[PDB]
Amino acid sequence: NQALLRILKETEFKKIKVLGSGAFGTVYKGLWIPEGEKVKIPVAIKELREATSPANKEILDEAYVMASVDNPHVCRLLGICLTSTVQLIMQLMPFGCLLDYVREHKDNIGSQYLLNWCVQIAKGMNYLEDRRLVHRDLAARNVLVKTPQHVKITDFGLAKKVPIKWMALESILHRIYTHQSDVWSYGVTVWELMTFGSKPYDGIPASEISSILEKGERLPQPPICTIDVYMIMVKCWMIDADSRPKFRELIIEFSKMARDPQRYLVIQGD
Ligand SMILES: *[C@@H](CC(=O)Nc1cc2c(Nc3ccc(OCc4ccccn4)c(Cl)c3)c(C#N)cnc2cc1OCC)CN(C)C
């Protein structure tokens, strides 16, 4: 179709530096210069190394699926460069990533800027769930910042070495991913959010995990974060999928907290 996805050619941009990496591919702050038109436009870029190639085209059929998303908390794909390597370009969000960013400013951060981010990310999925689209990878590192008040969800639907420290039991056990597997990736993404970006399990061996969970363990309570909140992070880490809390229920609960965080997220700052 002729969606809102713009197909560009290698003669419209040229990376300039490396921002992030790891996962499927990397990313750089290239410079888009629409052909025939003029306007040094800035944009990122992901040169996905490989995947599996199970035609060299589907890579597109999905793009449009990435270009359809109609959510203010779910980054939408701009264009794409098809060739010896697929190039994913999009609007450059000058702000870091929910991950690093935060980390950067754990000082005067805010009980609100977070008690939302959790509502912004949760509100982001509730849409993906309504579209039969599974992320497969949800982490502070996979969430951009279009403003310390407007966060969006990047990277998702791509898969269509692994984030064991995020995935669930099944996904780790029986490579099974569902609208329930993320609810697990979420409650965590926030934890790293509450503990101002902190590699969960710092130490343990990705392997020893499948077990550590088999008996509900580790993943302490983010000092700050109060109680009722944690129950949200934990209740999301249930071994019985049908036990977790669908985001639709996560958005209504977080919105009930944000309207008075000073009492839900203790902090010795302000
Ligand atoms: C955080 C480092 C960090 O801040 N990295 C970034 C990333 C971006 C991105 N990210 C991004 C995401 C996806 C892209 O494409 C594929 C795609 C798009 C949408 C949905 C699914 N898949 C591309 Cl090309 C880039 C964007 C975008 N879009 C814009 N600006 C970014 C800035 C940036 O850092 C800026 C300093 C922790 N590291 C591990 C990465």
Swiss-Prot record:
Range of the intact protein held here: 700 to 984 of 1210
Expression sites (tissue/organ): Ubiquitously expressed. Isoform 2 is also expressed in ovarian cancers.
UniProt-reported outcome of changing G20C: Found in a lung cancer sample
PTM annotation, UniProt: Phosphorylated on Tyr residues in response to EGF. Dephosphorylation by PTPRJ prevents endocytosis and stabilizes the receptor at the plasma membrane. Dephosphorylated by PTPN1 and PTPN2. Monoubiquitinated and polyubiquitinated upon EGF stimulation; which does not affect tyrosine kinase activity or signaling capacity but may play a role in lysosomal targeting. Polyubiquitin linkage is mainly through 'Lys-63', but linkage through 'Lys-48', 'Lys-11' and 'Lys-29' also occurs. Deubiquitination by OTUD7B prevents degradation. Ubiquitinated by RNF115 and RNF126. Ubiquitinated by ZNRF1 or CBL at different lysines in response to EGF stimulation; leading to recruitment of the ESCRT machinery and subsequent degradation in the lysosomes.
Enzyme active site: D137
Linked pathology: Lung cancer: A common malignancy affecting tissues of the lung. The most common form of lung cancer is non-small cell lung cancer (NSCLC) that can be divided into 3 major histologic subtypes: squamous cell carcinoma, adenocarcinoma, and large cell lung cancer. NSCLC is often diagnosed at an advanced stage and has a poor prognosis. Neonatal nephrocutaneous inflammatory syndrome: An autosomal recessive disorder characterized by intrauterine growth retardation, premature birth, fragile skin, recurrent skin infections and sepsis, failure to thrive, nephrocalcinosis, and nephromegaly with tubular dysfunction. Some patients have chronic diarrhea, and necrotizing enterocolitis.
Glycyl lysine isopeptide (Lys-Gly) (interchain with G-Cter in ubiquitin) cross-link site: K17, K38, K57, K215, K246, K256
Domain Protein kinase: 13-265
Effect of H135L: Found in a lung cancer sample; more sensitive to gefitinib than wild-type
Subcellular location: Cell membrane; Endoplasmic reticulum membrane; Golgi apparatus membrane; Nucleus membrane
Effect after changing L133V: Found in a lung cancer sample; more sensitive to gefitinib than wild-type
PTM sites of type N6-(2-hydroxyisobutyryl)lysine: K46
Outcome of swapping G20D: Found in a lung cancer sample
Listed name of the protein: Epidermal growth factor receptor
Result, substituting G20S: Found in a lung cancer sample; somatic mutation; strongly increased kinase activity; constitutively activated kinase with higher levels of basal autophosphorylation; more sensitive to gefitinib than wild-type
